[PDB]
Design an enzyme around this catalytic site. Sequence first.
Site, mmCIF file in Angstrom:
data_model
loop_
_atom_site.group_PDB
_atom_site.id
_atom_site.type_symbol
_atom_site.label_atom_id
_atom_site.label_comp_id
_atom_site.label_asym_id
_atom_site.label_seq_id
_atom_site.Cartn_x
_atom_site.Cartn_y
_atom_site.Cartn_z
ATOM 1 N N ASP A 117 0.964 -1.358 0.008
ATOM 2 C CA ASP A 117 0.001 -0.559 0.109
ATOM 3 C C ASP A 117 1.212 1.540 0.016
ATOM 4 O OD1 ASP A 117 -2.621 2.005 0.017
ATOM 5 O OD2 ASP A 117 -2.441 1.440 2.417
ATOM 6 N N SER A 148 -4.432 -7.048 5.283
ATOM 7 C CA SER A 148 -5.746 -7.040 5.891
ATOM 8 C C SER A 148 -6.073 -8.796 6.311
ATOM 9 C CB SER A 148 -6.184 -6.872 4.355
ATOM 10 O OG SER A 148 -5.471 -5.919 4.375
ATOM 11 N N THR A 149 -6.879 -8.623 7.263
ATOM 12 C CA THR A 149 -6.970 -10.248 7.537
ATOM 13 C C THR A 149 -8.224 -10.498 6.839
ATOM 14 O OG1 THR A 149 -8.849 -9.799 9.200
ATOM 15 C CG2 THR A 149 -6.297 -9.982 10.116
ATOM 16 N N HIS A 166 -6.671 -0.469 10.739
ATOM 17 C CA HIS A 166 -8.149 0.098 10.314
ATOM 18 C C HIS A 166 -8.568 -1.081 11.122
ATOM 19 C CE1 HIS A 166 -6.215 1.760 6.719
ATOM 20 N NE2 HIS A 166 -6.036 3.142 7.509
ATOM 21 N N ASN A 200 -12.490 -3.039 10.575
ATOM 22 C CA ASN A 200 -13.449 -3.328 9.327
ATOM 23 C C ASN A 200 -14.803 -3.816 10.178
ATOM 24 O OD1 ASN A 200 -12.470 -1.576 6.286
ATOM 25 N ND2 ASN A 200 -11.118 -2.916 7.772
ATOM 26 N N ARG A 224 -19.545 -1.234 5.144
ATOM 27 C CA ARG A 224 -18.292 -1.614 5.580
ATOM 28 C C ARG A 224 -17.678 -0.394 6.254
ATOM 29 N NH1 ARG A 224 -12.547 -1.605 4.004
ATOM 30 N NH2 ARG A 224 -13.191 -1.453 1.915
ATOM 31 N N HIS A 250 -14.915 1.796 8.207
ATOM 32 C CA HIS A 250 -13.407 1.637 7.782
ATOM 33 C C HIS A 250 -13.320 2.269 8.906
ATOM 34 C CE1 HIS A 250 -10.315 3.186 4.957
ATOM 35 N NE2 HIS A 250 -9.903 1.941 5.424
HETATM 36 N N1 LIG Z 1 -18.383 -6.321 4.314
HETATM 37 C C1 LIG Z 1 -17.386 -5.625 4.651
HETATM 38 N N2 LIG Z 1 -16.994 -6.359 6.292
HETATM 39 C C2 LIG Z 1 -16.050 -5.902 7.494
HETATM 40 N N3 LIG Z 1 -15.799 -6.349 6.629
HETATM 41 C C3 LIG Z 1 -15.232 -6.585 5.976
HETATM 42 C C4 LIG Z 1 -16.317 -6.747 4.870
HETATM 43 N N4 LIG Z 1 -15.307 -6.943 3.960
HETATM 44 C C5 LIG Z 1 -13.958 -7.222 4.227
HETATM 45 N N5 LIG Z 1 -13.466 -7.006 5.512
HETATM 46 C C6 LIG Z 1 -12.614 -6.816 5.773
HETATM 47 O O1 LIG Z 1 -12.423 -5.337 5.894
HETATM 48 C C7 LIG Z 1 -10.839 -5.681 4.743
HETATM 49 C C8 LIG Z 1 -10.804 -4.848 3.409
HETATM 50 O O2 LIG Z 1 -8.771 -4.589 3.396
HETATM 51 P P1 LIG Z 1 -8.437 -4.017 2.588
HETATM 52 O O3 LIG Z 1 -8.932 -4.675 1.028
HETATM 53 O O4 LIG Z 1 -6.975 -4.109 3.425
HETATM 54 O O5 LIG Z 1 -9.773 -2.792 2.849
HETATM 55 P P2 LIG Z 1 -9.031 -0.912 2.364
HETATM 56 O O6 LIG Z 1 -10.188 -0.453 1.010
HETATM 57 O O7 LIG Z 1 -9.715 -0.290 3.858
HETATM 58 O O8 LIG Z 1 -7.845 -1.099 1.653
HETATM 59 C C9 LIG Z 1 -10.653 -7.027 5.847
HETATM 60 O O9 LIG Z 1 -9.464 -6.660 6.841
HETATM 61 C C10 LIG Z 1 -11.631 -7.778 5.599
HETATM 62 O O10 LIG Z 1 -11.221 -8.849 6.155
HETATM 63 MG MG LIG Z 2 -3.359 0.627 3.395
HETATM 64 MG MG LIG Z 3 -8.726 0.668 4.665
HETATM 65 MG MG LIG Z 4 -5.801 -2.130 2.676
HETATM 66 MG MG LIG Z 5 -10.423 -0.925 -0.590
HETATM 67 NA NA NA Z 6 -4.478 4.872 2.979
#
Ligand SMILES: Nc1ncnc2c1ncn2[C@@H]1O[C@H](COP(=O)(O)OP(=O)(O)O)[C@@H](O)[C@H]1O
Ligand SMILES: [Mg+2]
Ligand SMILES: [Mg+2]
Ligand SMILES: [Mg+2]
Ligand SMILES: [Mg+2]
Ligand code: NA
EC number: 3.4.-.-
Length: 464
Positions: A58, A65-66, A119, A121, A203, A205
């Site tokens: 990033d 991201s879990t 972050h 979520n 979601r 954030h």
């Molecule tokens: N609908 C949802 N509700 C809650 N958590 C979600 C959902 N979809 C994905 N996630 C979690 O959100 C995070 C997404 O990571 P990432 O792709 O890095 O997000 P970002 O768009 O903020 O960069 C992960 O930890 C994933 O498990």
């Molecule tokens: Mg990031």
């Molecule tokens: Mg994020």
């Molecule tokens: Mg991310």
């Molecule tokens: Mg994203």
């Molecule tokens: Na960022």
Amino acid sequence: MHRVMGIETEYGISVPHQPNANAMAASSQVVNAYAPIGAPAQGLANVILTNGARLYVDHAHPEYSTPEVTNPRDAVLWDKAGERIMAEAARRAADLPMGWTIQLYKNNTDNKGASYGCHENYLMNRSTPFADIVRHLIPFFVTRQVFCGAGRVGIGADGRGEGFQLSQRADFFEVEVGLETTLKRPIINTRDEPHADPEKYRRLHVIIGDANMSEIATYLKLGTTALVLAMIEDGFLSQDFSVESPVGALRAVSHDPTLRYQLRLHDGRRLTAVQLQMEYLEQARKYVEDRFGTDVDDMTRDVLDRWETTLVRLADDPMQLSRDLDWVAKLSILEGYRQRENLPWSAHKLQLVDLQYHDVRPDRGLYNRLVARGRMNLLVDEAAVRTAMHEPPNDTRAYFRGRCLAKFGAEIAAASWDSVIFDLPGRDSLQRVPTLEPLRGTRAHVGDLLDRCRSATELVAALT
Ligand SMILES: Nc1ncnc2c1ncn2[C@@H]1O[C@H](COP(=O)(O)OP(=O)(O)O)[C@@H](O)[C@H]1O
Ligand SMILES: [Mg+2]
Ligand SMILES: [Mg+2]
Ligand SMILES: [Mg+2]
Ligand SMILES: [Mg+2]
Ligand code: NA
């Protein structure tokens, strides 16, 4: 407790003795050194792992991201697996020809002015008004750092003010509500990319929290927030906890690790951060009784009990929480240096120790050295963490995602939160299988199907 959630962690990164090394290149080496056991995510390295997680560059940081989980204990488990993945990736990067030696830190600042994100979520219902989310989370986020903070040596964004504060991130936030994550950072981020049906789901954030090493801190962070969100969604909270100057209060709370700073609420009440947290705990308790009574599940009861206990101990003597809270454990270490070596808070060595606490290496990170001595309360065991590096949670769509990558990895062209893209021998076009419901695609839904299928072709055929 049951709510879809996940944690993104941007890792601090350095290349020792290459002090000007390009951080994007170093981050790319880390992710590319682990990529042999994932699939590309749908021009920097960006992959999905067999545990359902995303691992990617990033901009200037490697990010893990879990997979989606349903509760704060599983959030701790798959987030901890991310630390092991980062450590192994850096180890492997150094073994490759011309590979750099790369150090990684599960924190939020390099103490040189840069700030990066951990972050949270949370799956929410579209029908919850965003104004309510804002009104009720700002006071909670301002004050939860009394148990969520990871600690930081240095005051102000440039870290040149002398002292210790509760949180890494407080000094870097400037506005109450907004879209950015790297400039003009908002206490409430408004990004709306749900990775699900946006008519049903949001979601949420959350970008304000410090990365935590302690499992108790990560557990409380995710669990208490999830309980507050349940109160917001039902419309339970009657009180208005709005604080007069939220950004100012965020910093002032952080800058007073004696926990005596009194917030001014809009209604003129003066409460400590701990006291406002207690009012949230008591509301949470009334809400769970009214909606569940004596039928409360054991994890909800545990989070409520740990949240209450922690606040009482913080009010009595925070130092008795050194096995539980990152800022307390880190402060304990730092005060030991100050006593042994007669160092003021401005000493450079204290900022090195601050950073060392977060080193992902098992023998170099100070948190990891405490764990090696059995000195931190843990929620999961290391055997489970190691399993969680490679296998997904069983009760979200991450199960389908991760197991498809493990079993049918030869026939996967790409994957993401909301789909898996298959390449079937003999089929001209790529086959996109959407995974839009976060709670579909669990072991209960598809475990037997995946057991039975010997190829992606049999799986894809069965799903259409
Ligand atoms: N609908 C949802 N509700 C809650 N958590 C979600 C959902 N979809 C994905 N996630 C979690 O959100 C995070 C997404 O990571 P990432 O792709 O890095 O997000 P970002 O768009 O903020 O960069 C992960 O930890 C994933 O498990
Ligand atoms: Mg990031
Ligand atoms: Mg994020
Ligand atoms: Mg991310
Ligand atoms: Mg994203
Ligand atoms: Na960022």
